């Protein structure tokens, strides 16, 4: 089906120490494939997925130099922002960046991203048209002017529609055994009696890949959106995922409820009722 | 494959 590549960068200022902490990771869909950490001993890009290991020494030298420069940039970005917003130096601050591309089922470019947040709030982002920037405040407008003068969107488009996509296909075909697989959810239901008149029902979804899944509860065919308890989809640790959803149900009224699972791995959407 | 252009803020 559809696939995506993403890189995530986090840099955090450390007033109690000299250097900021910088962390970078790469994902293909929901599988991490590389990392870099400014405090690691190696000071190199490291592989995190079996199938990125078949890449040559030329790939590793290149990704390492590019990431170290990403690192230096974001170290300096910290200073620049602390300047823009007139903040002192004693307090820790976080810059986050993300960029990457998506491809359709035909493996052709669909969309691309390049966005930042500062201290958790959106700062600037590439727009869907891939030629414009969104800047939320006046500080970000300063960044937007620098970038327009240096034609960054046009250079980014070049990367997003060429390099990002080409690499993604390359990864998809080497990690075919991992990345192009489909694992359907293993599903079951559990009952718990909170008290004399009420009871929680949980709809379990296990061992599935990729992470996208949909769990909805129904009462008499109707969507029970509010009253449904939904946990964050969570990694099992072996490249599969787990999710559940629960509803507080009146004692003896259990069998009027239905759980509905949706997943790419699933030939037909399943409908679970308690027995 | 990372990008090789490094814009600043």
């Amino acid at each position, epitope marked *: 089906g559809s696939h995506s590549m993403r890189y995530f960068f986090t840099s955090v200022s450390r007033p109690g120490r000299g250097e900021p902490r910088f962390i970078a990771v790469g994902y293909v869909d929901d599988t991490q494939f590389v990392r870099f950490d400014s405090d690691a001993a190696s000071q190199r890009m490291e592989p995190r997925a079996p199938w990125i290991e078949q890449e040559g020494p030329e790939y590793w030298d290149g990704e390492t130099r590019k990431v170290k420069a990403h690192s230096q940039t974001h170290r300096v970005d910290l200073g620049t922002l602390r300047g823009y917003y007139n903040q002192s130096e004693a307090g820790s601050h976080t810059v986050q960046r993300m960029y990457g591309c998506d491809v359709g089922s035909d493996w052709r470019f669909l969309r691309g991203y390049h966005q930042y947040a500062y201290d958790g709030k959106d700062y600037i982002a590439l727009k869907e048209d891939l030629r414009s920037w969104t800047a939320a405040d006046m500080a970000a407008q300063t960044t937007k002017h620098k970038w327009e003068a240096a034609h960054v969107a046009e250079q980014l488009r070049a*990367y997003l529609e*060429g390099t990002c996509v080409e690499a993604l296909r390359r990864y998809l075909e080497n990690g075919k055994e991992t990345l192009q697989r489909t694992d359907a959810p293993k599903t079951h239901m559990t009952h718990h009696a909170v008290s004399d008149h009420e009871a929680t029902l949980r709809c379990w979804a296990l061992s599935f890949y990729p992470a996208e899944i949909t769990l909805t509860w129904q009462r008499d065919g109707e969507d029970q959106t509010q009253d449904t308890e939904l946990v964050e989809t969570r990694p099992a640790g072996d490249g599969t995922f787990q999710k559940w959803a629960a509803v507080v149900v009146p004692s003896g009224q259990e069998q009027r409820y239905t759980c509905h699972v949706q997943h790419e791995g699933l030939p037909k959407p399943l409908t679970l009722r308690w027995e | 494959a990372l990008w090789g*252009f490094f814009p600043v803020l």
Partner: T-cell receptor
Amino acid sequence: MDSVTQTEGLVTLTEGLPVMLNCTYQSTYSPFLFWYVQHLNEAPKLLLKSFTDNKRPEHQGFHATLHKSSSSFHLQKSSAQLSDSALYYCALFLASSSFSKLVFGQGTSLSVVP
Amino acid sequence: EAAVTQSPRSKVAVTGGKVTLSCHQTNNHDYMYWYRQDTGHGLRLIHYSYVADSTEKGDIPDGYKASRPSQENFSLILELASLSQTAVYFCASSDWVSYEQYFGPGTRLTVLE
């Protein structure tokens, strides 16, 4: 692959006639090109950028248009003048997959005569 | 402004001697580059640096070493000069907008038997 090909050698042009220096390239990814100039016994410096809309970034002075279809970035001017005599470099900028670097051509010497 | 300086401006060296070209730059640029100029080869990158205390190999690093002791200074080093290395050498610098590089005046080196 990822190269630059310029007009080979010395170009001799009579003042007041149109300059026309050839650059063609080969690029894997979307092309960004730059003309540098070196006057005799001077530092090379940036002359022009391939950015702009379509392929026209400068009028009376030097200008160039990028044609992606035939991979051309020819340097042009309407009326050469003696002060234009210099060495001109065509450069490809690679910053998509590889770390930002300029890939220069062999340069073309322009000699404008009275 | 953006003014790069190089020294020496000229040098006559013997084959197998140690040669050190120096660059200095006060433009607050993190990026520096060393090129060499020849006939029918133009400007070929030898070494570059994106931050103080690190160097990367360029298109033609062989026979050359590089040093970035600080943001301002960037050295090109020939340990055993050879006739092939007779050329004009250029040092350049830029900020993040790295396709706009500012060049030093240049250094003419000649190597002799």
